[PDB]
Structure 1
Amino acid sequence: MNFSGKYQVQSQENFEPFMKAMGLPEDLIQKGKDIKGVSEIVHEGKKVKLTITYGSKVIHNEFTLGEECELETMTGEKVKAVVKMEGDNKMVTTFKGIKSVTEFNGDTITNTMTLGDIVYKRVSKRI
């Protein structure tokens, strides 16, 4: 059942374009592009807590629907974006031209971001 729990990062699209647009150069990405991570989410009314681990460093992403909250990226940059949450755990946040869609269906998670002009899709699977 979808709400909270651990869903592990398996794969993503544009882990380089996304980085390349935001600050990290593709070559710096290249050396470290396809890092596996783990996500642990706590579902509480409006307020969704996301724990996301990058290698050694776990980078948290806790936000309340309909609120400007600071998003900590897998890179390390934290940004204010207003994210709303459906209920069946759809998390959609908009910042400038950055569109982040997180949808949990059947305990399988797809995160889709658009960064600059880049289209990013991540597969996260519950453990």
Structure 2
Amino acid sequence: MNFSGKYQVQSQENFEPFMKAMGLPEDLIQKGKDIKGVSEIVHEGKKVKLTITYGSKVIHNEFTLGEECELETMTGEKVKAVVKMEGDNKMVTTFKGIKSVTEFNGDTITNTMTLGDIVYKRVSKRI
């Protein structure tokens, strides 16, 4: 599945509870509650490039399929994580103890983030 290009997030779930646990107050939560961003996915061989905008900040990371790859956060902390495709459509990468699932269906992507108890989802659709 080589369909590298940009994907702008449309739908998302559980943004509040994630940011809430992230230390975000309901008031700021309600404001951020409908923020997504523009993501870009370029898949080369095993490695797939992920550029994801969260509101103001943009994280650019590339990872190798079935291969241990280091995930670089918006903090600069980069950790070796092994990503291969779980969710059947796209790949899951566990890093910093957090479990991140991606599902790529045709032109749409379902991004499921898992932090301990808090689960987070985004759906990015082809632009």
- Shorter chain as denominator, the TM-score bin is 0.7 to 0.9
Counterpart Cα distance in 1 of 2:102 and 2:36: 18
Does the CA contact (< 8 Å) of 1:19 and 1:26 recur in 2? no
Query: How high is the sequence identity, in percent, across the aligned residues?
Result: 100
CA RMSD of aligned residues (A): 3.3
- SS of equivalent residue, structure 1 residue 18: helix
Does the CA contact (< 8 Å) of 1:113 and 1:121 recur in 2? yes
Counterpart Cα distance in 1 of 2:110 and 2:10: 11
Counterpart Cα distance in 2 of 1:29 and 1:77: 25
Does the CA contact (< 8 Å) of 1:4 and 1:42 recur in 2? yes
Cα distance per residue 1:80-127 (max 9 Å; x no partner): 432124798621112475322111112111111221212222111001
In terms of mean alpha carbon deviation, does 73-82 or 97-106 score higher? 73-82
Q: How far off its partner does 1:56 sit?
A: 4.3
Q: How far off its partner does 1:47 sit?
A: 0.9
In terms of mean alpha carbon deviation, does 84-93 or 39-48 score higher? 84-93
Cα distance per residue 1:32-55 (max 9 Å; x no partner): 332131111111011111111234
- SS of equivalent residue, structure 1 residue 39: strand
Does the CA contact (< 8 Å) of 2:100 and 2:112 recur in 1? yes
Q: How far off its partner does 1:30 sit?
A: 3.7
- Any stretches of 5+ residues in structure 1 without a counterpart? none
Q: How far off its partner does 1:13 sit?
A: 1.2
TM-score in terms of structure 2 length? 0.74
| Structure possessing the higher relative contact order (Cα contacts under 8 Å, 6 or more residues apart) | 1
Counterpart Cα distance in 2 of 1:74 and 1:12: 20
Q: How far off its partner does 1:12 sit?
A: 1.4
Aligned length: 127
Does the CA contact (< 8 Å) of 2:79 and 2:96 recur in 1? no
